[PDB]
Every structure is written in structure tokens, then in C-alpha cells.
Design a protein around this motif. Structure first.
Motif, short mmCIF file in Angstrom:
data_model
loop_
_atom_site.label_atom_id
_atom_site.label_comp_id
_atom_site.label_asym_id
_atom_site.label_seq_id
_atom_site.Cartn_x
_atom_site.Cartn_y
_atom_site.Cartn_z
N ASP A 47 0.20 -6.64 -3.56
CA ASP A 47 0.03 -7.14 -4.91
C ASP A 47 1.37 -7.66 -5.42
O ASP A 47 2.43 -7.19 -4.99
CB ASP A 47 -0.48 -6.05 -5.85
N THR A 69 0.83 -1.20 0.00
CA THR A 69 0.00 0.00 0.00
C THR A 69 0.86 1.25 0.00
O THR A 69 1.70 1.44 0.89
CB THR A 69 -0.94 0.00 1.22
N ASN A 70 0.66 2.09 -1.02
CA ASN A 70 1.35 3.36 -1.23
C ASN A 70 2.84 3.19 -1.51
O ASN A 70 3.62 4.13 -1.29
CB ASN A 70 1.16 4.30 -0.04
N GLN A 102 -8.26 -3.89 -11.23
CA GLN A 102 -7.61 -2.68 -11.72
C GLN A 102 -6.86 -1.98 -10.60
O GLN A 102 -7.27 -2.01 -9.43
CB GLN A 102 -8.62 -1.71 -12.32
N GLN A 103 -5.74 -1.36 -10.95
CA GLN A 103 -4.93 -0.64 -9.98
C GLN A 103 -5.61 0.68 -9.61
O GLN A 103 -6.24 1.32 -10.46
CB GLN A 103 -3.53 -0.38 -10.55
N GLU A 152 -5.46 14.52 -6.24
CA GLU A 152 -4.64 13.63 -5.42
C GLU A 152 -3.17 13.82 -5.82
O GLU A 152 -2.88 14.17 -6.96
CB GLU A 152 -5.09 12.17 -5.59
N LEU A 175 -4.99 4.40 -8.14
CA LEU A 175 -3.88 5.34 -7.98
C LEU A 175 -3.86 5.99 -6.61
O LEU A 175 -2.82 6.52 -6.21
CB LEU A 175 -3.94 6.43 -9.06
N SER A 176 -4.97 5.95 -5.86
CA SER A 176 -4.98 6.52 -4.51
C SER A 176 -4.14 5.67 -3.56
O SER A 176 -3.38 6.20 -2.74
CB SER A 176 -6.41 6.63 -3.99
N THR A 177 -4.26 4.35 -3.65
CA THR A 177 -3.61 3.44 -2.73
C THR A 177 -2.48 2.65 -3.36
O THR A 177 -1.72 2.00 -2.63
CB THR A 177 -4.64 2.46 -2.15
N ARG A 178 -2.35 2.69 -4.68
CA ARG A 178 -1.38 1.89 -5.43
C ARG A 178 -1.63 0.39 -5.27
O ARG A 178 -0.71 -0.41 -5.44
CB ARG A 178 0.05 2.23 -5.04
N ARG A 179 -2.86 0.01 -4.96
CA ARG A 179 -3.22 -1.38 -4.73
C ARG A 179 -4.30 -1.78 -5.71
O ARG A 179 -5.07 -0.95 -6.18
CB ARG A 179 -3.70 -1.60 -3.30
N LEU A 180 -4.35 -3.08 -6.02
CA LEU A 180 -5.33 -3.60 -6.96
C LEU A 180 -6.69 -3.67 -6.29
O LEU A 180 -6.82 -4.20 -5.18
CB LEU A 180 -4.91 -4.97 -7.48
N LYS A 181 -7.69 -3.13 -6.96
CA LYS A 181 -9.06 -3.06 -6.46
C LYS A 181 -9.98 -3.50 -7.60
O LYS A 181 -10.15 -2.76 -8.58
CB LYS A 181 -9.40 -1.65 -5.96
N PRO A 236 -4.68 2.74 -14.44
CA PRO A 236 -5.82 1.81 -14.33
C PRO A 236 -6.10 1.07 -15.62
O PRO A 236 -6.44 -0.12 -15.59
CB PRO A 236 -6.98 2.74 -13.92
N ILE A 269 0.69 6.82 -12.22
CA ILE A 269 1.89 7.04 -11.42
C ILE A 269 3.10 6.73 -12.29
O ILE A 269 3.21 5.64 -12.84
CB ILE A 269 1.90 6.18 -10.15
#
Lengths: 213, 220, 12
Positions: free
Chosen positions: A85, A40-41, C2-3, B154, C5-11, B41, B92
């Protein structure tokens, strides 16, 4: 462009179990595959190079195998710091390409949320808007309901939820529900209540306040 | 040790161009190539290109016409520049360095630069206290926080007591309100008995708008 | 899938 297919999309396991990540390539790529972790982040972190070679500073519980088109990233005894991930990368063919990633979630025992409620600050009210925040802290699993009531009227559509990613230490989640009113609406009512339902509670928990105190 | 440090996140308007600076240390640009990767995304992880030890560039095929990578060896800086951005170029962006001078196994990454492609305008957040009370104390634990409201784009960074407070912190993911501005809360739980003695400050930084706020959060 | 961008985690 080589297509890398990672499966499954999400992996959910309990601490101490073994776990494998599949990366399949659209044509043979030898052993020219690398694995990355992303928390995360975070930015990606190189775990394995060339299918099976160790990387300095990477816990020994990480290993990889495979050749040709079928590749496996293995964690022999998973820990909660492994919540992340994981991506594969091929570089046998230009340009280098990455798979789409597998998510690693962890199971744990049920943990009921601790519920806190926060009235709007007088600072916000000067701007003419009122946010009421309900915090559900350190719970498992992720499913929870928050129900807002204002003077016994059920609130609908005027709240937004946010859930943290899984905690790397205790594997819980925390959730925030923000209820947004105008100052005029807020001033027009008295009892503000957040009702929380979760598998770890034998009955819903209500945290409320009267405007003022 | 080996580090790569990127310039801050920002807004770029549609059709306009993106510029990121990677400043490296722990090695010399004359000895290693620096690659650029992004995370979006739509396309996920996507290798963009590379500038090699000797100054040659390679660009991934869909970007050859609008990508350009340069560097100042003496200043240890790599300059990424991409033309005519659209919405799906929101991503990013990372600079990376491989293990060896010639390879593509990326052992070192910058921190990433979240780029938003939007016609909208930058807007700093307002920061409101989420004050502890009895309605926010449970068995010796008090919860407190900061409401970081109405900013774009953001990201925003939130720490507590200038970095010294990390245990029990949850900074929630931003949510996009119907106004098209983001909002989030950052919370922390602390011993209620320390509310009298200790000071609790959320440090908010919205780098796209150069907005730094320190909000003291006190019991009401 | 899908990734985010707020958390950089797959959601999803």
C-alpha cells in the motif's frame, strides 16, 4: 484539516509496466507532501519528501511530482517487491494528515495451486475438537473454491478460509481452508475430502484421507 | 543505526488507559522530537502528537484532553499514554522520528503496537501440528505446519526453526471464530527427503498472554 | 479500502 484523496483504491499492473499514484488535496498545499510504502506486516517506509525529493536508500525507480493540489507518485518499471500500500502525507497545514492509500497488486501468469490435506492431530482430539486443514499453495490468481465432503455429504458453514497477501517474490497467493468438527462427529465418519477448483486446473483436484490411515 | 523499539501489544478494557513505551537508539531525545501516529480501520493513518527536543508537547485536536506524552532523556524512553479508550481506539500505534529535529517527514518508525480495546480476557493459544504425510507430499516436496488455535487478542508471531527457516513459509492471516477467539495456521514446504534428518519447529509467541510454545512437527 | 490490523494491508 486538509483532506487527501488517493485514487484509485486498487492498482493492478504487470511487472515492468509504469504506474502512477494520485494524491489530490482539498486545498493548495504547495509541495508539502510526502509518500510512504507499507508492506505486509510492516511499518511505513518514507519514499519521497516534499513532492519530488529523493530519500537515501530508496530504489531510483521511485519518483514524485506535482504542486498545489495534484500529486503523483511514480514507479517507472514495477517489480514484485513493490507489492504494497502507498500513502501520501501533507504537512503544509497543521495538523499533518494522510490519505487513505492505494493498493498495488501485480499481475502474473496463471499458477495452479498445489493441494495438501492434514487430518486432525491426536493432540487436538484430546480436547474434543477436530480441525481438518486443506492447504492451497502458491497459485494465481486469487480466486479459488474449496469444497468439503464428509462421507459424500457436502459440508457447509463449518469451514473458514484465509488467504495470504501476495508474495513479494513470485506474486502468488496461498490459501487455507479449515474444517471444524466435534470429536464425536469426526469419529462418526471415515472419508474426509477437500476438492479444489481454480483457473489453473483443467479439472477439480481432490485430496482426501480415511480416518486412521 | 537509528532504531525505535516499542513495548508489546496488549488488551485494554473499555474506559481504561493505554500506555506504550518507545525506546530509541542511534540518536538522542534531546536532539529530535518523537511523534506518535496510529493506524485504525475507521480513520486510517492519523497523527496523534509529538514531544519535542525540549519537552514541549503538541496533541492533535481530538486528543488534547485524553493524551499525554512524557520522556526520560537519560533512558532514551518516550512514554505514550491515552485515557478512556473505546472500541474505535483499537489500532496499531507507532512512534516515529523525522529526518530533521523540527519536521514531520517520518523516516524512522517503531515496529507498531497493536492495541485491542475489548472487555474480553486474554487467552493463550493451543498449538497443534499439521503433520506431513503422503497426503501432503507432491513430487519430492512435503508440506507441514502448526495450527495456532483459540487465542485472544491478536497478534501472534510464528517463525520456523528459531528464524533459520524462512523460505516457503506462509503464516496465514488470523480469522475470528464464532467463539470470539482467533485461529491461524503457519505452513512451510520442505524437501520430503529431509523429514528424516531435519527437525522442524514452529516457534509461537502470543505476547499479550506471555505464551511461548515451540511445537515440533513430525511425520505421523 | 479499509486497513486490516492483522496484516497491516488495505482490504476493501
Amino acid at each position: 484539516d486538509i483532506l487527501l484523496t488517493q485514487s484509485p483504491v486498487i492498482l493492478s499492473v504487470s511487472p515492468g509496466e509504469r504506474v502512477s499514484f494520485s494524491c489530490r488535496a482539498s486545498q493548495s498545499i504547495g509541495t508539502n507532501i510526502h509518500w510512504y510504502q507499507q508492506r505486509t506486516n510492516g511499518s511505513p517506509r518514507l519514499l519521497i519528501k516534499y513532492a519530488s525529493e529523493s530519500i537515501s536508500g530508496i530504489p531510483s525507480r521511485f519518483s514524485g511530482s506535482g504542486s498545489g493540489t495534484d500529486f503523483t507518485l511514480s514507479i517507472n518499471s514495477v517489480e514484485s517487491e513493490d507489492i504494497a500500500d502507498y500513502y501520501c502525507q501533507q504537512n503544509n497545514n497543521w495538523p499533518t494528515t494522510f490519505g487513505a492509500g492505494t493498493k498495488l497488486e501485480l499481475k502474473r501468469t496463471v499458477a495452479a495451486p498445489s493441494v495438501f490435506i492434514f487430518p486432525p492431530s491426536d493432540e487436538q482430539l484430546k480436547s474434543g475438537t477436530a480441525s481438518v486443514v486443506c492447504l492451497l499453495n502458491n497459485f494465481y490468481p486469487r480466486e479459488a473454491k474449496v469444497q468439503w465432503k464428509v462421507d459424500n455429504a457436502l459440508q457447509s458453514g463449518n469451514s473458514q478460509e484465509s488467504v495470504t497477501e501476495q508474495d513479494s517474490k513470485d506474486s502468488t497467493y496461498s490459501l487455507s481452508s479449515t474444517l471444524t468438527l466435534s470429536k464425536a462427529d469426526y469419529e462418526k465418519h471415515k472419508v474426509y475430502a477437500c476438492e479444489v477448483t481454480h483457473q489453473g486446473l483443467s479439472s477439480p483436484v481432490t485430496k482426501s484421507f480415511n480416518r486412521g490411515a | 543505526q537509528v532504531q525505535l523499539k516499542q513495548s508489546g501489544p496488549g488488551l485494554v478494557q473499555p474506559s481504561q488507559s493505554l500506555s506504550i513505551t518507545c525506546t530509541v537508539s542511534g540518536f538522542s531525545l534531546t536532539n529530535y522530537g518523537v511523534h506518535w501516529v496510529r493506524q485504525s480501520p475507521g480513520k486510517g493513518l492519523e497523527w496523534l502528537g509529538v514531544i519535542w527536543s525540549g519537552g514541549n508537547t503538541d496533541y492533535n485536536t481530538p486528543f488534547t484532553s485524553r493524551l499525554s506524552i512524557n520522556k526520560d532523556n537519560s533512558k532514551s524512553q518516550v512514554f505514550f499514554k491515552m485515557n478512556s479508550l473505546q472500541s474505535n481506539d483499537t489500532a496499531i500505534y507507532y512512534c516515529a522520528r523525522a529526518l530533521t529535529y523540527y519536521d514531520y517527514e517520518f523516516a524512522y518508525w517503531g515496529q507498531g503496537t497493536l492495541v485491542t480495546v475489548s472487555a474480553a480476557s486474554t487467552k493463550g493459544p493451543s498449538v497443534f501440528p499439521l503433520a506431513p504425510s503422503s497426503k501432503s507430499t507432491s513430487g519430492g516436496t512435503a508440506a507441514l505446519g502448526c495450527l495456532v488455535k483459540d487465542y485472544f487478542p491478536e497478534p501472534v508471531t510464528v517463525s520456523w526453526n528459531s528464524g533459520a527457516l524462512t523460505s516457503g513459509v506462509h503464516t496465514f492471516p488470523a480469522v475470528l471464530q464464532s467463539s470470539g477467539l482467533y485461529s491461524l495456521s503457519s505452513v512451510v514446504t520442505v524437501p520430503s527427503s529431509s523429514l528424516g534428518t531435519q527437525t522442524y519447529i514452529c516457534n509461537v509467541n502470543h505476547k499479550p498472554s506471555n505464551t511461548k510454545v515451540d511445537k515440533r512437527v513430525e511425520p505421523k | 479500502g479499509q486497513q486490516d490490523l492483522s496484516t497491516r494491508r488495505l482490504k476493501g
